[PDB]
Design a binder for this molecule. Sequence first.
Ligand SMILES: *Cc1c(COP(=O)(O)O)cnc(C)c1O
Ligand SMILES: *Cc1c(COP(=O)(O)O)cnc(C)c1O
Lengths: 384, 384
Amino acid sequence: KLLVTPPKALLKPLSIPNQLLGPGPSNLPPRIMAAGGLQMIGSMSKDMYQIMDEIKEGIQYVFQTRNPLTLVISGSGHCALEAALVNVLEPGDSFLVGANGIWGQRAVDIGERIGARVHPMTKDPGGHYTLQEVEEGLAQHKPVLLFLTHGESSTGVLQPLDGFGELCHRYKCLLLVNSVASLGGTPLYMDRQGIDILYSGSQKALNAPPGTSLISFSDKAKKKMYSRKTKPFSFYLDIKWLANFWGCDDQPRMYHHTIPVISLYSLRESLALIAEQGLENSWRQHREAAAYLHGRLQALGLQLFVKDPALRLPTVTTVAVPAGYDWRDIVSYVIDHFDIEIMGGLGPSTGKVLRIGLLGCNATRENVDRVTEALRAALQHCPK
Amino acid sequence: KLLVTPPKALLKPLSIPNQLLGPGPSNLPPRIMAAGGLQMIGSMSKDMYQIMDEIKEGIQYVFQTRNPLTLVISGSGHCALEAALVNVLEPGDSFLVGANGIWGQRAVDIGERIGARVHPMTKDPGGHYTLQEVEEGLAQHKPVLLFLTHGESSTGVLQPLDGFGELCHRYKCLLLVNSVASLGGTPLYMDRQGIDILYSGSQKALNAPPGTSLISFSDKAKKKMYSRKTKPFSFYLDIKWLANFWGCDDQPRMYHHTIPVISLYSLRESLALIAEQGLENSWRQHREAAAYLHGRLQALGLQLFVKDPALRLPTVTTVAVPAGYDWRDIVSYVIDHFDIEIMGGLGPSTGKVLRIGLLGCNATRENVDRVTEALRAALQHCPK
Ligand SMILES: *Cc1c(COP(=O)(O)O)cnc(C)c1O
Ligand SMILES: *Cc1c(COP(=O)(O)O)cnc(C)c1O
């Protein structure tokens, strides 16, 4: 006899609330939900390949690149990061990291884990990196790779990018940029800013379900990875394998792992939506919304964490915890009474901030309202 | 001006054929497709946690275990493998591997990559492992971990399991079993067979979309992993992190990575279906079908790769390439003329075999027919 019996809770039907305006993930639009409900096809079929090919073109379009080594990572944001680090870095190599919030911190941990030379340019939450703080580190530590967070979703900071690609190439270094938060909602041009490795997530402004990520590599990166003398520590993430499967190199596509088919359908659609909308219209939408939101938020009497408006990330706003409140009470209130998700801090910003998120189709004046009135109420009833 | 323009192909609407009876993935039933079409919820919400908790109970039920360290890996079959290896093996450690087809071979590559002592018990395609070939290796190489493929989908072989858990524990070793193919479609009892690490995939007999996997750890494994002195090479796959998030350990759930929400909805449902159906009824269904199929296949005049019926994997049948044919012609024919996917070999079995798959709700007499008549036709028209 079987000792473990059919779980009582599973024999009920699944049902989910109706809720998201935090740092992510974001709500899905009809078209993407529709894609997610479709039947499976052969995971190595002519049809599946065509879908992948369209996804690649879409990643080129949203990154603004023509890099032939552009493909989807079967896994979340951290997965894409770990993939870029584990294929570009042979143990010991020098690694320069912009540690201005949790997303540098994580790149640190990953770098350390794979045995790299880890030099963390540490900076309080709110801070960003000047060309000179960059040169200072490029000079003192002479790294083969630098990591910068573009949209720092844990501190609400937009990192300036122009010119750093070039600063890296003078010091022979490679530029890796995390655009999970920013991609789709602020200007970003891979080739025109000399970024070597650019990655993003499906779940932020693209409004896809979490679990896929986008990645692209320049030919300087492609060269470093293909002329490695060690094998990378992960098979799942071995780029030479992935590239082949994704049609990037010359050979016929050889099975590696099984791609998340139904998530790909979703991703494709999220790309078609933003391809139809167009990037500059997207960046406008996000910019305007962020401004509207900032205005209403100061109207409630709150103080924005990032003082300088040019340094604010449109997709994710940080707001200082108003004195005399418990941030958890406010957050609780908003979901408990209005069915709306916002978030507190994260990593360094923990307990310092509240975070509010405008991502893709969910970055509207309408939603800003809803969240404004939710915060009003919480400020009236959450104990002071 | 933006140099990369909106991709022409994306601005058309997505559409997919209607097709799957290969080694996997498998077709989805309505209920799972429905789940895949649902809206997002907060990825760290009380509701999301409850769903995860039900998924855990379901993994306990299908593995037959009460191991509190049981959870879902955000990633495919290889991801789950790499996760078990990267958390259980400190560099150098001795690693005994059942290399009887591609799935041992991959565990080899992964083991080598993370710097383990890799001893591959190599065996031609079709072969399985006796308790004595196991003891011989346990004795000569004295490993801390042994890997066995349960359902060898690349050779159609069901590996016997009874007693090997115990053989391992006498040599102090840990038993890791790959049940991606077999889980749901043949008998398997984690605790009653003394397996230390058991993993499976969402996409085989559970009929979920590819991109999630199941994993469970015994307390001997849990102890080895938690008392490591090196950190594991992957952050994404660090078990101490995952365990916490998945509610396994004592602490409140701390954000690690973002779980594939919508895939989880799907997984939950695939588990509820088999929980309602019950395992022994599932194993019956699969067993019967496999027998029906074997009969019809010899009727067409074909010769089954695995001679001994007790060693045949119900979920995946291997059939010898009939002399004078091009296996690619046959496979092509079947999809091209009937909208049915089957597969050729893989790894060692490449070009030797054809593979036919009966997985979950798609393991029916009905589908066996359809594929039988497809093969008939291909044998009449595919050039000899
Ligand atoms: C959301 C986000 C991440 C997290 O990605 P996961 O899906 O949690 O792996 C990382 N970096 C940035 C900038 C983000 O906005
Ligand atoms: C399908 C299958 C795999 C492959 O899993 P991926 O999703 O390709 O990572 C591995 N092992 C076995 C036994 C299988 O049946």
